[PDB]
Design a protein around this ligand. Sequence first.
Ligand code: NI
Ligand code: NI
Lengths: 79, 79
Amino acid sequence: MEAVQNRIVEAAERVPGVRGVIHLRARYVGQDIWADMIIGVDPENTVEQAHEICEAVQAAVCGKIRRIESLHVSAHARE
Amino acid sequence: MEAVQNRIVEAAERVPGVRGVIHLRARYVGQDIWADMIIGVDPENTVEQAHEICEAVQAAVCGKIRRIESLHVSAHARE
Ligand code: NI
Ligand code: NI
């Protein structure tokens, strides 16, 4: 699991507009991972931009870690 | 293991100068992976350049897949 969490954080951090991973909770449901995360974003990004960054994180993380079958990504102002 | 082999191939293919993965054999030794691979390279690269590409593949693949504890990379002319 720690190897999986490290991969999730690394994948998320490589997406344009991510200012770190604030929170990540991952759980196994069988052999699948279900995860919930919060990313940091520029406080001056629009809410629509933050939504786009979250969607990009979801695509990036699910594309790179095939065992993830549910991923929720939300955003919070940081830096 | 197939998930691991897919990650090895994908990581190798993203290194400048790799013209596909020609061969990959991976084995578990305990929880560790030992692997041997052959990459394709430009036939007009020098032997020194091919050596540099192999070393770059080794770094890239070992950096991305933490369970690998031995990786040998060789090169063959392709395309
Ligand atoms: Ni949308
Ligand atoms: Ni050298």
